[PDB]
Design a protein around this ligand. Sequence first.
Ligand SMILES: *[C@@H](O)[C@H](C[C@@H]1C=CNC1=O)NC(=O)[C@H](CC(C)C)NC(=O)OCc1c(F)c(F)c(F)c(F)c1F
Ligand SMILES: *[C@@H](O)[C@H](C[C@@H]1C=CNC1=O)NC(=O)[C@H](CC(C)C)NC(=O)OCc1c(F)c(F)c(F)c(F)c1F
Lengths: 298, 299
Amino acid sequence: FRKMAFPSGKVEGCMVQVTCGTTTLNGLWLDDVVYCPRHVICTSEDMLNPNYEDLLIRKSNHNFLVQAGNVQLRVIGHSMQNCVLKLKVDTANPKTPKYKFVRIQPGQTFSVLACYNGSPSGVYQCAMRPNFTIKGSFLNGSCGSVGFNIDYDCVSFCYMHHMELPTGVHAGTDLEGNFYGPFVDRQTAQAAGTDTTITVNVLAWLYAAVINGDRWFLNRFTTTLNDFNLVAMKYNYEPLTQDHVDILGPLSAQTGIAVLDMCASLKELLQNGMNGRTILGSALLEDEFTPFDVVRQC
Amino acid sequence: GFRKMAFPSGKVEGCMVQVTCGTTTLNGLWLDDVVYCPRHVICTSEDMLNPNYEDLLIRKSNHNFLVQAGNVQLRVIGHSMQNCVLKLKVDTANPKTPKYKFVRIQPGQTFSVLACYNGSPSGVYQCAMRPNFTIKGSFLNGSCGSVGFNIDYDCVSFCYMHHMELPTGVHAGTDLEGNFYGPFVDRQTAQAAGTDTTITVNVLAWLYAAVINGDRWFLNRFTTTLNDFNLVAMKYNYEPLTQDHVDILGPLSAQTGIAVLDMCASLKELLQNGMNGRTILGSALLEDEFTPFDVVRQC
Ligand SMILES: *[C@@H](O)[C@H](C[C@@H]1C=CNC1=O)NC(=O)[C@H](CC(C)C)NC(=O)OCc1c(F)c(F)c(F)c(F)c1F
Ligand SMILES: *[C@@H](O)[C@H](C[C@@H]1C=CNC1=O)NC(=O)[C@H](CC(C)C)NC(=O)OCc1c(F)c(F)c(F)c(F)c1F
């Protein structure tokens, strides 16, 4: 198994750059709207604690430079929705895919198209951590880069990049401008909660091992969801939700191993360790492959 | 931060088509008015074991080839074979053809793979050409004709087209002239590769990356000569480090202030003692599919 991203072409056709003064970041051009982080309107000095409502009242459409490549797109309206700026432009993007805006849950994965000056540089797979940070690869000028999933014809945009935390992890918003986690778009020292292991993905990984014939860790017992959750928390594993149990359904069906039986096997691994054994050629349990990701590669 | 990063695949997605002959369907690459695909599309079950490709191809007509770009069928007006690649001339030019070239990459170099099925892009990931000329990919039935590539400025350099899986689960294919990487053959037989080695210049680049991201537990105040490092490397089936490799690592040496041969001394200690439970950049194993260029660009 490797981290595999979605093909990025449909998102590449939507990337633009947005400039205020000398501050340039990336924006997302869908139909006749460009979406970008609101701190494009901040002077580097006013990022310490911005008054965004006041900064925006001083702004007019003609203060925003939006370019697709070197081609200017005229702005004909502007508004702020939470931490994102919406710029109405006079041209509908002819490359607009079928799309939706979704708010993902911790543990879910997505592809990130890292962009600079509206030009894509690379694509990679990310997982949203339980503490609502992602372990991205972002440099200055990357803000406005987006995270997405593709289902059939349709791009689901789930993430827009806004900042780096002191520990080197990244934080941002959905495409409605609502931050993931307790973060704010201010150049102030902020800390994420202690991270935990994404239990539902570890289970998916154990199912994947079974599908490939590596099944030494299966035991003869089961557990309740509540007993498993209380034990899991003592090992800094995320508790399982009902949605987690449901998304493991297809893999449970494929293998014939009930979700709660796999939980009992995982509890034994937590309590007894690997005792020098490997699973899928690894002594470490992987937690950034979702049940969908496993199916995508099996 | 530091992730395995692939090139944006849009320019390549615009070239992928579906190619069918008989009950065999795989992917093709449509550049200008030519479609490139693996020649084994013309085989049947009984052909696969020892296909006489020149014989099988002379028995085919242009109309035995069904090329589909989305909902549109492209008319094949010509066909020829170049080594293990079939070239189908079509009556329409692909307007989405990027600026491109065909290159043959060296072992140790990396490239992005756009995995496709029935002509439709499925996923994108970064691979390295292994020293034994395999690649560790994620390829299923129907993935043949998927390509590997690098992008420089606006130019797509195609370096790989996918043809087969080996019993060990690694993969083999050709350049776009149809010549295999490695000693493999496009016939339905179980083939083993030569002994693989670890790409040492890449492991060093990845150790520099871990330092750039604040992770330095594995460093030491020992040093080594290049030849004495290479003796130990070869003992552990690591590729020897050349002076060109040392030079390529300069920028990373500069950025971190850590002499290349000091990083070689750190790697030597890791080879001899192991990680003792520790991890580097999250990994329990030393990673060798990031080049110095890959590390620098991403930092
Ligand atoms: C995009 O504009 C940019 C991307 C950022 C910079 C390099 N890697 C990244 O992820 N985002 C910012 O510069 C952002 C703008 C704010 C939200 C208005 N600020 C930021 O990321 O700085 C983080 C930060 C900080 F604010 C500190 F005070 C600090 F001490 C830090 F160490 C730190 F990382
Ligand atoms: C594309 O047509 C396909 C891709 C392949 C299939 C599953 N994963 C992949 O990468 N290529 C083939 O199936 C290829 C066709 C040949 C070149 C005519 N054959 C192949 O990959 O199987 C190899 C193989 C084999 F031929 C054996 F006999 C065997 F015992 C194997 F274990 C084995 F892997």
